[PDB]
Amino acid sequence: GEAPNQALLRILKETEFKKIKVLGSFGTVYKGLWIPEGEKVKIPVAIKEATSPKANKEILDEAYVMASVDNPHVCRLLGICLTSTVQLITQLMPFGCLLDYVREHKDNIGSQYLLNWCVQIAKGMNYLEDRRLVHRDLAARNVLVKTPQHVKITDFGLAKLLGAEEKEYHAEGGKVPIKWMALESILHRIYTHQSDVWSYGVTVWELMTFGSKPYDGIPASEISSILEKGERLPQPPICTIDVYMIMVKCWMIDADSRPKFRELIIEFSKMARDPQRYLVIQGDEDMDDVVDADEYLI
Amino acid sequence: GEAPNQALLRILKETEFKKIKVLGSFGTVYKGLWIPEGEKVKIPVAIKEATSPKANKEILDEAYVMASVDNPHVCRLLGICLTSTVQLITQLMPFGCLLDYVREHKDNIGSQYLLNWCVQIAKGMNYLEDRRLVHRDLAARNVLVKTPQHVKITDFGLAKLLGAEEKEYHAEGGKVPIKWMALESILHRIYTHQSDVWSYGVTVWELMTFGSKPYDGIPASEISSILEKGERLPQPPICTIDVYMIMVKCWMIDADSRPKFRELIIEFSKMARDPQRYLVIQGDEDMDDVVDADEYLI
Numbered sequence: 069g070e071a072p073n074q075a076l077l078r079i080l081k082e083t084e085f086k087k088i089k090v091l092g093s094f095g096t097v098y099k100g101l102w103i104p105e106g107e108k109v110k111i112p113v114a115i116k117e118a119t120s121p122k123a124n125k126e127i128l129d130e131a132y133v134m135a136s137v138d139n140p141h142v143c144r145l146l147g148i149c150l151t152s153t154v155q156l157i158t159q160l161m162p163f164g165c166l167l168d169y170v171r172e173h174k175d176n177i178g179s180q181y182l183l184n185w186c187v188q189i190a191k192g193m194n195y196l197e198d199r200r201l202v203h204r205d206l207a208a209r210n211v212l213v214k215t216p217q218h219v220k221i222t223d224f225g226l227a228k229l230l231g232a233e234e235k236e237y238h239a240e241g242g243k244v245p246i247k248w249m250a251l252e253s254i255l256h257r258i259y260t261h262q263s264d265v266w267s268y269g270v271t272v273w274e275l276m277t278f279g280s281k282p283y284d285g286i287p288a289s290e291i292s293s294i295l296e297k298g299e300r301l302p303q304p305p306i307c308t309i310d311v312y313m314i315m316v317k318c319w320m321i322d323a324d325s326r327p328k329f330r331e332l333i334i335e336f337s338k339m340a341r342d343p344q345r346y347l348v349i350q351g352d353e354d355m356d357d358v359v360d361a362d363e364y365l366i
Numbered sequence: 367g368e369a370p371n372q373a374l375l376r377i378l379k380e381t382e383f384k385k386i387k388v389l390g391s392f393g394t395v396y397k398g399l400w401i402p403e404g405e406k407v408k409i410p411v412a413i414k415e416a417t418s419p420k421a422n423k424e425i426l427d428e429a430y431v432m433a434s435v436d437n438p439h440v441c442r443l444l445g446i447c448l449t450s451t452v453q454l455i456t457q458l459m460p461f462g463c464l465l466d467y468v469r470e471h472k473d474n475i476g477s478q479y480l481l482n483w484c485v486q487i488a489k490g491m492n493y494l495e496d497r498r499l500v501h502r503d504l505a506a507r508n509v510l511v512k513t514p515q516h517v518k519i520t521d522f523g524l525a526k527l528l529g530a531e532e533k534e535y536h537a538e539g540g541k542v543p544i545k546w547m548a549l550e551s552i553l554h555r556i557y558t559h560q561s562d563v564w565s566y567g568v569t570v571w572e573l574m575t576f577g578s579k580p581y582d583g584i585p586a587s588e589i590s591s592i593l594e595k596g597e598r599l600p601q602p603p604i605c606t607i608d609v610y611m612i613m614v615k616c617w618m619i620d621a622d623s624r625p626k627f628r629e630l631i632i633e634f635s636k637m638a639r640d641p642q643r644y645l646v647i648q649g650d651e652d653m654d655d656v657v658d659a660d661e662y663l664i
């Protein structure tokens with residue numbers, strides 16, 4: 069069939085960590101510290117906390133996905149705590165979602181950064197493709213910032229692990245973010261790693277325009293029509309044709325004609341060696357026991 | 367028994383790469399470029415080239431090991447070329463072995479670096495332990511420098527993959543580097559991940575003393591005696607007792623009493639957040655298509 073998922077799901081004791089402040093508000097997210105008992109470490113973590121049998125089902129499914137992945141560019145799940153309300157414990161990503169971050173720092177974001185992020189995101193997604201996993205919701209809002217030099221992919225709430233020989237995923241009805249979806253996805257609810265590539269393309273466009281909304285002001289209703297007309301998102305001001313060309317390819321109607329994440333890594337990597345050649349931006353240039361989750365291993 | 371090693375051994379065509387200059391001279395090592403055909407990439411690589419049926423056996427065994435590992439802190443094997451003489455193609459590590467590198471740059475090596483290297487090396491070794499692999503030859507001469515901020519473990523010429531339930535490796539006779547070996551290894555040719563920890567300890571000492579030779583001038587003959595006497599390598603000048611304490615533990619006679627690599631990561635990681643507190647050092651502060659192997663994936 070396929071390989072045995074021997075990932076480990078760690079169950080955390082509530083006494084083991086303390087919420088410190090609120091981060092957001094669905095359920096409710098906190099920043100806090102996890103202190104495994106008897107190890108002298110403190111780990112900055114994000115804690116996500118009515119009780120719907122359906123809602124629990126979803127969060128548990130997400131936990132399942134996150135627990136099955138391990139990559140420097142994908143969010144790491146530390147554990148779950150099974151209190152009346154289930155809590156997801158993940159690594160704390162200090163600078164929040166990348167979409168809010170390019171918006172809030174446009175005047176300090178250089179080409180070196182933009183290209184590095186495009187590279188890391190492709191590495192993340194290429195890893196996911198290796199693990200035969202399709203994200204289905206890749207977008208700037210779904211990439212968190214550990215540091216300005218290190219981003220990771222998140223929000224596995226829609227991800228699907230393709231079965232043994234299943235190569236497309238056929239969803240059957242849902243509330244999906246249409247502006248980041250491939251055309252096959254919109255017309256036939258078919259999802260693929262290549263479908264992901266399309267969203268990667270739109271994601272890159274969000275970064276290149278410092279946070280602009282795709283098809284701003286265009287009802288999702290018609291988005292589908294537009295794409296068939298042969299239309300696409302416009303070339304961002306800072307983008308040399310080289311970069312834009314890559315986006316446009318991520319948006320070919322023939323999915324097999326789009327590039328592979330492993331190719332996206334090489335291309336954006338090359339451009340990252342000489343940033344200024346590919347992106348033209350104005351003026352380019354107690355806690356003694358705190359340990360980052362990236363250094364805390366089982 | 368255990369999991370199926372589905373790693374991929376890539377066989378490279380000789381036409382596909384060119385040696386550019388000599389790096390060292392056993393057989394002979396070169397720096398060159400690998401250009402997969404039809405991909406527009408050029409990859410800086412190291413090429414290692416009488417023909418002894420025994421010698422081939424060894425290099426092939428090494429290739430086997432290197433092809434089975436994948437970690438940011440372990441050397442990556444790109445492929446082998448089966449010409450009259452077998453050639454190993456690995457990623458080019460520009461700054462050479464770390465032992466030569468701390469020697470050649472003592473006056474520019476700060477605590478931030480030393481501690482980061484101790485961290486990366488522990489991550490490498492912890493990864494190897496996860497892969498049930500025992501290195502048996504960890505030492506500063508066996509760590510290469512990709513950049514001053516990124517080192518990787520190498521030389522798998524002695525490594526052993528422990529069998530299904532085999533937990534010690536019992537070698538049967540060899541030319542082994544005694545000054546980096548655990549006491550059980552010297553007296554009983556027994557090797558363990560914990561045995562590796564001992565060598566990690568000596569390795570760290572080499573870094574902390576900027577390249578000094580362990581037990582300088584003491585015949586390997588007696589090394590064994592000394593250790594039983596309760597003696598060990600001396601505390602390096604720059605080492606706060608905190609750091610030295612860690613080395614000393616890597617050298618406990620009871621192997622299970624030594625720390626685990628995953629613990630070594632946490633400890634040196636913590637110290638890396640405030641370097642100056644743990645190490646006291648004087649004055650602490652064409653090729654358009656070139657792609658680093660770390661960005662070239664299958």
Ligand SMILES: Nc1ncnc2c1ncn2[C@@H]1O[C@H](COP(=O)(O)OP(=O)(O)NP(=O)(O)O)[C@@H](O)[C@H]1O
Binds near residue numbers: 114116159160
């Ligand atoms: N690990 C984390 N570290 C720091 N911030 C996080 C982390 N996880 C989530 N956040 C932020 O917490 C807030 C809510 O996150 P999330 O659970 O994705 O809800 P959302 O995407 O903002 N809205 P919704 O999709 O309706 O639940 C957002 O600011 C997230 O970016």
Ligand SMILES: Nc1ncnc2c1ncn2[C@@H]1O[C@H](COP(=O)(O)OP(=O)(O)NP(=O)(O)O)[C@@H](O)[C@H]1O
Binds near residue numbers: 458
């Ligand atoms: N991938 C590499 N990149 C750069 N330098 C390398 C690489 N691999 C090996 N070298 C260097 O090439 C020279 C020989 O390497 P190696 O094959 O380990 O022989 P050695 O350890 O120096 N001597 P020996 O153990 O007797 O073969 C040394 O300077 C190595 O550090």
